Coordinates of C-alpha atoms and ligand atoms in Angstrom, one line a residue:
Chain A
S1 CA 0.1 -0.1 0.0
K2 CA 2.5 2.4 -1.1
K3 CA 1.2 6.1 -0.5
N4 CA 1.0 9.3 -2.8
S5 CA 2.2 12.6 -0.9
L6 CA 3.4 15.9 -2.3
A7 CA 6.8 15.0 -2.5
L8 CA 6.6 12.7 -5.5
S9 CA 4.7 15.3 -7.8
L10 CA 7.1 18.4 -7.0
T11 CA 8.6 19.8 -10.1
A12 CA 12.2 19.8 -9.8
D13 CA 12.1 23.6 -9.1
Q14 CA 9.3 23.2 -6.4
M15 CA 11.4 20.5 -4.9
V16 CA 14.3 23.4 -4.2
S17 CA 12.3 26.3 -3.2
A18 CA 10.8 23.7 -0.9
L19 CA 14.2 22.7 0.8
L20 CA 15.3 26.2 0.5
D21 CA 12.6 27.9 2.2
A22 CA 13.0 24.9 4.5
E23 CA 16.5 25.9 5.8
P24 CA 17.1 26.6 9.3
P25 CA 18.6 29.7 11.0
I26 CA 22.2 30.5 11.4
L27 CA 22.6 30.6 15.1
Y28 CA 25.3 32.3 17.2
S29 CA 27.8 31.5 19.9
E30 CA 27.7 33.3 23.2
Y31 CA 31.5 32.8 24.2
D32 CA 33.5 35.9 25.4
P33 CA 36.7 36.2 23.5
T34 CA 38.6 36.6 26.8
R35 CA 39.1 33.5 28.6
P36 CA 41.5 31.2 26.7
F37 CA 39.7 28.0 25.1
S38 CA 40.8 25.1 27.3
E39 CA 39.9 21.6 26.1
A40 CA 36.6 21.8 28.1
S41 CA 35.9 25.7 27.2
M42 CA 35.5 25.0 23.5
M43 CA 33.8 21.5 23.9
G44 CA 31.4 23.2 25.9
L45 CA 31.1 26.2 23.4
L46 CA 30.8 24.0 20.5
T47 CA 28.5 21.1 22.3
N48 CA 26.3 24.2 23.2
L49 CA 25.9 25.4 19.9
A50 CA 25.3 21.7 18.5
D51 CA 22.6 21.2 21.2
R52 CA 20.6 24.3 20.4
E53 CA 21.2 24.0 16.4
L54 CA 20.0 20.5 16.8
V55 CA 16.4 21.8 18.2
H56 CA 16.0 23.7 14.7
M57 CA 17.4 20.7 12.6
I58 CA 14.3 18.7 14.2
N59 CA 12.0 21.3 13.0
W60 CA 13.8 21.3 9.6
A61 CA 13.3 17.7 9.0
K62 CA 9.5 18.2 9.3
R63 CA 9.7 20.3 6.2
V64 CA 11.7 18.0 4.3
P65 CA 9.5 16.5 1.2
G66 CA 8.5 12.9 2.0
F67 CA 9.6 12.9 5.5
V68 CA 6.6 13.4 7.3
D69 CA 4.9 10.5 5.0
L70 CA 7.1 8.0 7.2
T71 CA 5.9 7.0 10.4
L72 CA 7.0 9.1 13.5
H73 CA 9.2 6.7 14.9
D74 CA 10.9 6.2 11.8
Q75 CA 11.1 9.8 11.3
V76 CA 13.2 9.9 14.7
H77 CA 15.3 7.1 13.4
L78 CA 16.4 8.7 10.3
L79 CA 16.9 12.2 12.7
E80 CA 18.8 10.8 15.1
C81 CA 20.7 8.6 12.9
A82 CA 22.2 11.5 10.8
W83 CA 22.0 14.7 13.0
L84 CA 25.8 14.8 13.1
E85 CA 26.3 14.3 9.7
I86 CA 23.7 17.1 9.2
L87 CA 25.5 19.3 11.8
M88 CA 28.6 18.7 9.8
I89 CA 27.7 19.2 6.0
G90 CA 26.4 22.3 7.3
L91 CA 29.5 23.6 8.8
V92 CA 31.7 22.5 6.0
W93 CA 29.1 24.8 3.8
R94 CA 29.6 27.8 5.9
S95 CA 33.2 27.5 6.2
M96 CA 33.3 27.3 2.3
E97 CA 34.9 30.9 1.7
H98 CA 37.0 30.5 4.6
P99 CA 39.8 28.5 3.8
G100 CA 41.8 27.0 6.6
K101 CA 38.9 28.0 9.1
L102 CA 35.7 26.3 10.2
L103 CA 32.7 29.0 10.5
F104 CA 31.0 27.3 13.4
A105 CA 29.0 30.5 13.9
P106 CA 29.3 34.1 12.6
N107 CA 30.8 35.1 15.9
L108 CA 32.9 31.9 16.5
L109 CA 35.3 31.4 13.8
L110 CA 38.1 28.7 14.5
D111 CA 41.1 27.3 12.7
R112 CA 43.2 24.4 12.5
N113 CA 44.8 25.5 15.4
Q114 CA 42.1 25.9 18.3
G115 CA 41.0 22.5 17.2
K116 CA 44.3 21.4 18.9
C117 CA 42.9 22.9 22.1
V118 CA 41.2 19.5 22.5
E119 CA 42.5 16.2 22.5
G120 CA 41.8 14.3 18.9
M121 CA 39.7 17.4 17.9
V122 CA 42.4 18.2 15.4
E123 CA 42.0 15.3 13.0
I124 CA 38.3 15.9 12.7
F125 CA 38.9 19.7 12.2
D126 CA 41.5 18.6 9.3
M127 CA 38.7 16.3 7.7
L128 CA 36.1 18.9 7.9
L129 CA 38.6 21.4 6.5
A130 CA 39.3 19.1 3.6
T131 CA 35.5 18.7 2.9
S132 CA 35.1 22.2 3.3
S133 CA 37.8 23.1 1.1
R134 CA 36.6 20.2 -1.4
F135 CA 33.1 21.9 -1.9
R136 CA 34.6 25.2 -2.7
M137 CA 36.8 23.4 -5.4
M138 CA 33.5 22.4 -6.9
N139 CA 31.9 25.8 -6.5
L140 CA 28.9 24.0 -4.8
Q141 CA 26.0 25.8 -5.3
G142 CA 23.2 26.5 -2.2
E143 CA 20.7 24.7 -4.5
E144 CA 23.0 21.6 -4.6
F145 CA 23.7 21.9 -0.8
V146 CA 20.2 21.8 0.4
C147 CA 19.6 18.7 -2.0
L148 CA 22.7 17.0 -0.3
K149 CA 21.6 18.0 3.2
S150 CA 18.4 16.4 2.5
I151 CA 19.8 13.4 0.9
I152 CA 21.7 12.6 4.3
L153 CA 18.4 12.7 6.4
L154 CA 16.9 10.4 4.0
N155 CA 19.6 7.9 3.1
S156 CA 21.9 7.7 6.2
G157 CA 20.1 5.1 8.3
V158 CA 17.5 3.7 6.0
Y159 CA 18.7 0.2 5.7
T160 CA 18.4 -0.1 9.4
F161 CA 14.9 1.1 10.4
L162 CA 13.2 -0.4 13.7
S163 CA 11.1 -2.5 11.3
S164 CA 12.1 -5.6 9.2
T165 CA 8.5 -6.0 9.0
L166 CA 6.1 -5.5 5.8
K167 CA 5.2 -1.8 6.5
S168 CA 8.9 -1.2 6.6
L169 CA 9.3 -2.1 3.2
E170 CA 6.8 0.2 2.3
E171 CA 8.7 3.0 3.9
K172 CA 12.1 2.0 3.2
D173 CA 10.4 2.0 -0.5
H174 CA 8.9 5.6 -0.1
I175 CA 12.3 7.1 0.9
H176 CA 14.0 5.5 -2.1
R177 CA 11.4 7.1 -4.2
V178 CA 11.9 10.5 -2.7
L179 CA 15.7 10.2 -2.8
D180 CA 15.3 9.2 -6.6
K181 CA 13.4 12.5 -7.1
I182 CA 16.1 14.6 -5.1
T183 CA 18.7 13.1 -7.6
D184 CA 16.2 14.6 -10.5
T185 CA 16.4 18.0 -8.9
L186 CA 20.0 17.7 -8.5
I187 CA 20.6 16.6 -12.3
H188 CA 18.2 19.2 -13.4
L189 CA 19.7 22.0 -11.3
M190 CA 23.2 21.1 -13.3
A191 CA 21.5 20.9 -16.9
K192 CA 20.1 24.4 -15.9
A193 CA 23.6 25.5 -15.6
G194 CA 25.2 24.2 -18.9
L195 CA 26.8 21.0 -17.9
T196 CA 27.2 18.5 -20.5
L197 CA 25.1 15.2 -20.0
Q198 CA 28.5 13.6 -19.3
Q199 CA 29.5 16.6 -16.7
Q200 CA 25.9 16.1 -15.1
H201 CA 26.6 12.6 -14.4
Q202 CA 30.2 13.0 -13.1
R203 CA 29.2 16.1 -10.8
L204 CA 26.4 13.9 -9.5
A205 CA 28.8 11.2 -8.4
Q206 CA 31.4 13.7 -7.1
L207 CA 29.1 15.1 -4.8
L208 CA 27.4 11.8 -3.4
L209 CA 31.1 10.5 -2.8
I210 CA 31.7 13.4 -0.6
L211 CA 28.7 12.3 1.2
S212 CA 30.9 8.9 1.8
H213 CA 33.6 10.9 3.7
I214 CA 30.8 12.9 5.6
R215 CA 29.3 9.5 6.9
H216 CA 32.8 9.0 7.9
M217 CA 33.5 12.4 9.8
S218 CA 30.5 11.5 11.5
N219 CA 31.4 8.3 13.0
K220 CA 34.8 9.1 14.2
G221 CA 33.4 12.4 15.2
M222 CA 30.6 10.8 17.2
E223 CA 33.3 8.4 19.1
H224 CA 35.2 11.4 20.2
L225 CA 32.1 13.2 21.7
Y226 CA 31.3 10.2 23.6
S227 CA 34.9 10.2 24.7
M228 CA 34.9 13.6 25.8
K229 CA 31.7 12.9 27.9
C230 CA 33.6 10.0 29.1
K231 CA 36.1 12.5 30.6
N232 CA 33.3 14.6 32.2
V233 CA 34.4 17.6 29.8
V234 CA 31.0 17.7 28.1
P235 CA 27.8 19.7 29.6
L236 CA 24.6 17.9 30.3
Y237 CA 22.7 18.8 27.0
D238 CA 20.1 16.2 27.0
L239 CA 19.1 16.8 23.4
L240 CA 22.9 16.3 22.4
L241 CA 23.1 13.6 24.8
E242 CA 19.7 11.9 23.4
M243 CA 20.9 12.0 19.7
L244 CA 24.4 10.3 21.3
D245 CA 23.1 7.7 23.6
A246 CA 21.4 6.7 20.3
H247 CA 24.3 5.1 18.5
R248 CA 25.1 3.0 21.3
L249 CA 28.6 3.3 20.4
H250 CA 31.1 1.5 22.9
Chain B
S1 CA 52.6 18.6 -13.6
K2 CA 49.6 16.3 -13.8
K3 CA 50.8 13.2 -15.8
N4 CA 49.0 10.9 -18.5
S5 CA 48.7 7.0 -17.8
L6 CA 46.7 4.6 -19.5
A7 CA 43.4 4.7 -17.2
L8 CA 42.4 8.0 -18.7
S9 CA 42.4 6.8 -22.2
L10 CA 40.7 3.4 -21.7
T11 CA 37.4 2.8 -23.5
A12 CA 34.4 2.4 -20.9
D13 CA 34.6 -1.1 -22.1
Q14 CA 38.2 -1.7 -21.3
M15 CA 37.9 0.0 -18.1
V16 CA 35.3 -2.9 -17.3
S17 CA 37.4 -5.9 -18.6
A18 CA 40.4 -4.4 -16.8
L19 CA 38.9 -4.5 -13.3
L20 CA 37.0 -7.8 -14.3
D21 CA 40.3 -9.3 -15.2
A22 CA 41.7 -8.0 -11.9
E23 CA 39.6 -9.5 -9.5
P24 CA 40.9 -11.5 -6.9
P25 CA 40.3 -15.2 -6.1
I26 CA 37.6 -16.6 -3.7
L27 CA 39.2 -17.7 -0.6
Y28 CA 38.1 -20.6 1.6
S29 CA 37.8 -20.9 5.3
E30 CA 39.4 -23.9 7.1
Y31 CA 37.3 -24.4 10.3
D32 CA 36.2 -28.0 11.0
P33 CA 32.0 -27.9 11.4
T34 CA 32.6 -29.7 14.5
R35 CA 33.6 -27.7 17.5
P36 CA 30.7 -25.3 18.3
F37 CA 31.8 -21.6 17.2
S38 CA 32.8 -19.7 20.3
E39 CA 33.2 -16.0 20.3
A40 CA 36.7 -16.7 19.8
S41 CA 36.4 -19.6 17.5
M42 CA 34.6 -17.4 14.8
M43 CA 36.3 -14.5 15.3
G44 CA 39.6 -16.1 14.6
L45 CA 37.9 -18.1 11.7
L46 CA 36.6 -14.7 10.3
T47 CA 39.9 -12.7 10.9
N48 CA 41.9 -15.5 9.4
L49 CA 40.0 -15.5 6.0
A50 CA 40.2 -11.7 6.5
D51 CA 44.1 -11.4 7.0
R52 CA 44.5 -14.0 4.1
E53 CA 42.2 -12.3 1.9
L54 CA 43.9 -8.9 2.5
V55 CA 47.1 -10.5 0.7
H56 CA 45.4 -10.7 -2.6
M57 CA 43.6 -7.4 -2.1
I58 CA 47.1 -5.8 -2.0
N59 CA 47.8 -7.1 -5.1
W60 CA 44.2 -6.4 -6.6
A61 CA 44.9 -2.8 -6.1
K62 CA 48.1 -2.9 -8.4
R63 CA 45.9 -3.9 -11.1
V64 CA 43.3 -1.1 -10.6
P65 CA 43.6 1.6 -13.3
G66 CA 45.3 5.0 -12.2
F67 CA 46.3 3.3 -9.0
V68 CA 49.9 2.9 -10.0
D69 CA 49.8 6.4 -10.9
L70 CA 50.1 7.6 -7.4
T71 CA 53.1 7.6 -5.2
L72 CA 53.8 4.6 -3.4
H73 CA 53.0 5.9 0.0
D74 CA 49.5 7.2 -1.2
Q75 CA 48.7 3.9 -2.8
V76 CA 49.3 2.1 0.9
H77 CA 47.3 5.3 2.1
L78 CA 44.4 4.6 0.2
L79 CA 44.4 0.7 0.5
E80 CA 45.0 0.9 4.5
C81 CA 42.1 3.5 4.6
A82 CA 39.5 1.4 2.6
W83 CA 40.5 -2.4 3.3
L84 CA 37.7 -3.0 5.5
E85 CA 35.3 -1.3 3.0
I86 CA 36.6 -3.5 0.4
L87 CA 36.4 -6.6 2.3
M88 CA 32.8 -5.9 3.0
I89 CA 31.7 -4.5 -0.3
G90 CA 32.9 -8.2 -1.4
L91 CA 31.0 -10.2 1.4
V92 CA 27.8 -8.4 0.7
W93 CA 28.1 -9.2 -3.3
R94 CA 28.9 -12.9 -2.7
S95 CA 25.8 -13.0 0.0
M96 CA 23.9 -11.5 -2.8
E97 CA 21.9 -14.9 -3.6
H98 CA 21.3 -16.3 -0.1
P99 CA 19.1 -14.0 1.8
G100 CA 19.5 -14.1 5.6
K101 CA 23.2 -15.0 5.1
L102 CA 26.6 -13.8 4.7
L103 CA 28.7 -15.9 2.5
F104 CA 32.1 -15.2 3.9
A105 CA 33.5 -18.6 2.3
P106 CA 32.1 -21.0 -0.1
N107 CA 32.8 -23.4 2.5
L108 CA 31.9 -21.0 5.6
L109 CA 28.1 -19.9 5.5
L110 CA 27.0 -17.9 8.5
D111 CA 23.6 -16.6 9.2
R112 CA 22.2 -13.6 11.6
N113 CA 22.4 -16.4 14.3
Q114 CA 25.9 -17.3 14.3
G115 CA 26.6 -13.5 14.3
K116 CA 25.0 -13.7 17.8
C117 CA 27.8 -15.8 18.8
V118 CA 30.2 -12.9 19.2
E119 CA 29.6 -9.7 21.3
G120 CA 28.4 -6.8 19.4
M121 CA 28.8 -8.9 16.3
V122 CA 25.2 -9.1 15.3
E123 CA 24.2 -5.7 14.7
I124 CA 27.0 -5.3 12.1
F125 CA 25.9 -8.9 10.2
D126 CA 22.5 -7.3 9.9
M127 CA 23.9 -4.1 8.3
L128 CA 25.9 -6.4 6.1
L129 CA 22.7 -8.3 5.2
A130 CA 20.8 -5.0 4.8
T131 CA 23.1 -3.9 2.3
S132 CA 23.4 -7.6 0.9
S133 CA 19.9 -7.7 0.4
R134 CA 19.6 -4.1 -1.1
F135 CA 22.3 -4.9 -3.9
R136 CA 19.9 -8.0 -4.9
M137 CA 16.9 -5.7 -5.0
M138 CA 18.5 -3.7 -7.5
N139 CA 19.9 -6.6 -9.4
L140 CA 23.4 -5.2 -9.0
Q141 CA 25.3 -6.6 -12.1
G142 CA 29.1 -7.9 -11.6
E143 CA 30.3 -5.1 -13.7
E144 CA 28.8 -2.6 -11.8
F145 CA 30.3 -4.4 -8.6
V146 CA 33.7 -4.2 -9.8
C147 CA 33.2 -0.6 -10.5
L148 CA 32.0 0.2 -6.9
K149 CA 35.1 -1.8 -5.5
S150 CA 37.4 0.4 -7.5
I151 CA 35.3 3.6 -6.4
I152 CA 36.2 2.9 -3.0
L153 CA 39.7 2.0 -3.3
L154 CA 40.1 5.4 -4.9
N155 CA 37.7 7.5 -3.0
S156 CA 37.8 6.4 0.7
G157 CA 40.7 8.3 2.1
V158 CA 41.6 10.6 -0.6
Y159 CA 40.9 13.8 1.2
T160 CA 43.2 12.7 3.7
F161 CA 46.5 11.9 2.2
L162 CA 49.9 12.3 4.0
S163 CA 50.5 15.3 2.1
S164 CA 49.0 18.7 1.8
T165 CA 51.8 20.1 -0.2
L166 CA 52.0 20.6 -4.1
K167 CA 52.3 17.1 -5.4
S168 CA 49.4 16.2 -3.0
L169 CA 47.2 18.1 -5.0
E170 CA 48.2 16.8 -8.2
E171 CA 47.5 13.3 -7.0
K172 CA 44.4 14.1 -5.3
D173 CA 43.3 15.4 -9.0
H174 CA 44.4 12.5 -10.6
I175 CA 42.3 10.1 -8.5
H176 CA 39.2 12.5 -9.0
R177 CA 40.1 11.9 -12.8
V178 CA 40.0 8.4 -12.7
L179 CA 36.9 8.5 -10.6
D180 CA 35.2 10.6 -13.2
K181 CA 35.9 8.0 -15.6
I182 CA 34.8 5.0 -13.6
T183 CA 31.7 7.2 -13.4
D184 CA 31.3 7.0 -17.4
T185 CA 31.7 3.5 -17.2
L186 CA 29.0 2.8 -14.9
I187 CA 26.8 5.1 -16.5
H188 CA 27.7 3.4 -19.9
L189 CA 27.0 0.1 -18.5
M190 CA 23.7 1.2 -17.7
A191 CA 22.7 2.6 -21.1
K192 CA 23.8 -0.7 -22.5
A193 CA 21.0 -2.2 -20.4
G194 CA 18.1 -0.1 -21.6
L195 CA 17.7 2.5 -18.8
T196 CA 16.5 6.0 -19.7
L197 CA 19.1 8.7 -19.1
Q198 CA 16.8 9.5 -15.9
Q199 CA 17.2 5.8 -15.1
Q200 CA 20.9 6.0 -15.3
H201 CA 21.1 9.0 -13.0
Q202 CA 18.9 7.6 -10.4
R203 CA 20.6 4.1 -10.4
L204 CA 24.0 5.9 -10.1
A205 CA 23.0 7.7 -7.2
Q206 CA 21.4 4.8 -5.7
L207 CA 24.8 2.7 -5.9
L208 CA 27.1 5.6 -4.8
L209 CA 24.6 6.1 -1.8
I210 CA 25.2 2.4 -0.6
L211 CA 28.8 3.4 -0.5
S212 CA 27.9 5.7 2.1
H213 CA 26.5 3.0 4.3
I214 CA 29.5 0.7 3.7
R215 CA 31.9 3.4 4.6
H216 CA 29.5 3.4 7.8
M217 CA 29.6 -0.3 8.4
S218 CA 33.5 -0.1 8.1
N219 CA 33.9 2.5 10.8
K220 CA 31.5 0.6 13.3
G221 CA 32.8 -2.8 12.1
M222 CA 36.5 -1.4 12.8
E223 CA 35.8 0.1 16.3
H224 CA 34.6 -3.9 16.7
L225 CA 37.5 -5.7 15.6
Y226 CA 39.7 -3.2 17.8
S227 CA 37.4 -4.4 20.8
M228 CA 38.0 -8.2 20.0
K229 CA 41.7 -7.3 20.1
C230 CA 41.4 -5.6 23.4
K231 CA 40.0 -8.9 24.8
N232 CA 42.5 -10.9 23.4
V233 CA 40.3 -13.0 21.2
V234 CA 41.9 -11.9 18.2
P235 CA 44.5 -14.3 16.6
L236 CA 48.0 -12.2 15.9
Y237 CA 47.7 -11.5 12.3
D238 CA 50.2 -8.6 11.7
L239 CA 48.7 -8.1 8.0
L240 CA 45.3 -7.6 9.4
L241 CA 46.6 -5.7 13.0
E242 CA 48.5 -3.4 10.4
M243 CA 45.6 -2.5 8.4
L244 CA 44.0 -1.6 12.0
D245 CA 46.8 -0.1 13.9
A246 CA 46.4 2.3 10.8
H247 CA 43.2 3.8 11.8
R248 CA 44.4 4.6 15.2
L249 CA 40.9 4.4 16.5
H250 CA 40.7 4.7 20.0
Ligands
LIG1 C1 31.0 16.4 18.0 C2 31.9 17.5 18.0 C3 31.5 18.8 18.9 C4 30.4 19.5 18.0 C5 30.8 19.9 16.4 C6 29.8 20.8 15.8 C7 29.1 21.5 16.4 C8 28.1 22.5 15.5 C9 28.0 22.3 14.2 O1 26.8 22.9 13.7 C10 28.7 21.4 13.6 C11 29.8 20.4 14.3 C12 30.6 19.8 13.4 C13 31.7 18.9 14.3 C14 31.3 18.5 15.8 C15 32.5 18.0 16.8 C16 32.8 16.4 16.3 C17 33.7 16.2 17.5 C18 33.4 16.8 18.8 O2 33.1 15.8 19.8
LIG2 C1 36.3 -7.2 11.3 C2 35.2 -8.2 11.5 C3 35.9 -9.7 11.5 C4 36.0 -9.9 9.9 C5 34.8 -9.7 9.0 C6 35.3 -9.9 7.4 C7 36.0 -10.9 7.2 C8 36.4 -11.4 5.9 C9 35.7 -10.8 4.8 O1 35.9 -10.9 3.4 C10 34.8 -9.5 5.1 C11 34.6 -9.4 6.6 C12 33.3 -8.2 6.7 C13 33.2 -8.1 8.4 C14 34.5 -8.2 9.2 C15 34.1 -8.0 10.7 C16 33.4 -6.6 11.2 C17 33.4 -6.9 12.7 C18 34.6 -7.8 13.0 O2 35.4 -7.4 14.0

């Protein structure tokens, strides 16, 4: 009984202006450029931004096409299975124009060094800078971004729903369908820019292949946060703590 | 000074028969269906297969196009950054036709249960079965496979080379170039099968998106192996131990 929402009908353009209108606000950090960041100082500073930003992401999710067509539990699943990936593909986007620096917030701008203020934090920053950089090198257009962002919320953690029943397959299928359309939007947005057919193909792959690395930075970065929490350096942010105690990583 | 190898010229077809001829042999396990698998018993049984299989993978790598065009150190980097992903996209391929079971070796065939013989092992098996299953659901053709396999060896761990110099960018660029061609091979192999343009696009994305999950299973599965080694359940297989002490995961 595979239903029919709005997502599936949307014109390749509406699809865009949809995800585009959907975009959440750009938060701001509250630190005081006085006290020198300590391992703890920055962690808290970041995790704070994370936790808050995480509140808008939930709302963002609801606006993504086909997303509410899933079962509530399955929406939460997707959400908590990709939250960190999403937090990062955003960061990398914001950091596009500022090479060598990650624009966490317009008021909080860090570089490869600050990263060293926290253990193991460095490597990640570099991976984020590399992805950050790579995007810029392809001249990633804002429309493509929101497409990717959406693709993560829908792909990451789809093969692992709670279910393995019968309504699980319907769902698993709906998502695949929306994703297929998101692909059309992307391919479209690329022809609407000159790219040869060959180029469209290639650029598609190139973008999707970044999603591999992101997925990767998400795993490594998650193990990290868990560690900082085991060192009692992380503030008690229940939302962030939830999206973490969700991966059960040990 | 971006060189010009053979890879870049290859016809979309040669590209295939290249990777296809490149394929390594299908190993075999040596266990005795007598003694009941213990957490340790199977781990050793698997890790043994892993370690050995890992020997052919190295040789396989050399045969992949554009791969030897890199710097030796960079080849090792790629190799040790994706070894596990590769070991898995293979497993999943072998397990295609046997739903609910992972065909590690033609003589060693396990199911969702045996997985439970080892701690945390289960979840992974399921993820592998899901991917295993998903492939079958798309009727993944052997040619596409070898394409993916190659794409992993080249993409996974490219944004993180030793270098961040000047010869690093050349390299990083060559790979991107070969990858772009591997994309052409794929898109080609799909038109050579009827698929509309739209379908080619869509199926491309669909395959590449699996690579996200694989990357994921690789991270989680790696953390696992490290754990078993911390519990002294893993045999001392120096090659396997090398490709692990390479991720520095803690
Ligand atoms: C989760 C971490 C703190 C919060 C960081 C953050 C915080 C906010 C945000 O929008 C993106 C990111 C990306 C990387 C995250 C980090 C990865 C390592 C660290 O533990
Ligand atoms: C590395 C592990 C043992 C070896 C397993 C293997 C061994 C051989 C092979 O060809 C593929 C795989 C995939 C999953 C691997 C497992 C992931 C968890 C476990 O620690």
